[PDB]
Design a protein around this nucleic acid. Sequence first.
RNA 1: GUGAGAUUGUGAAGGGAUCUCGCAGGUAUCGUGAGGGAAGUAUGGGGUAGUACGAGAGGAACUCCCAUGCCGUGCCUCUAGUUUCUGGGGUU
Length: 134
Amino acid sequence: ANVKGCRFRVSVALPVGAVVNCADNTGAKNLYVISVKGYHGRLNRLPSAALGDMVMCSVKKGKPELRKKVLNAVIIRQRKSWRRKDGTVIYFEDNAGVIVNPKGEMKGSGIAGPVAKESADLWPKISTHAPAIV
RNA sequence: GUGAGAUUGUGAAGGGAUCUCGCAGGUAUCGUGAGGGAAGUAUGGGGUAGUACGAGAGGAACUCCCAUGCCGUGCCUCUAGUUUCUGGGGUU
Ligand SMILES: [Mg+2]
């Protein structure tokens, strides 16, 4: 009940099972999409994520201080091409996420690469620490 | 009444009677709408508002906009997929 009807429709990229990068410097190196917040159910359909979506994750490779637990990440990059409303189709080289709180605070201090305009606008802690808002 | 046929079990040319139905519709377009089917359904955000209420802790809602999930009917401008146009090229 936080972010769903706030940004436009984006082509979903990362279903449950996906293993994305951690651009956050929380010591982790890896996420694993466990589910997606905002998934109203459809039979046989997986929870899939897009740029602005908060996911439920677990670190599969990183510090054991936060590895075997269910965390909250926010997607910032995806390889799946999404069409913006100004008619431009755009995509990243890699998928990445950044771990957050249940309320959205970034839990680290810096992002590796860029972030999108789609995920920075929903999350002001993500738009602050990002070196380039794509 | 008027046209058209048939009376095919024992040879042939004749022409009598009788039965069967044909005697008005065909073609083309625009509509009617009985009856039957039947569909859209949910959500979050904005502000209202940190207001109502309350000792405080806490903490609403409608109009009104903005989006979105599931579904439905299509579509191919874009992007993506597909190539037996074996199209052009490359290579063993
Ligand atoms: Mg009716």
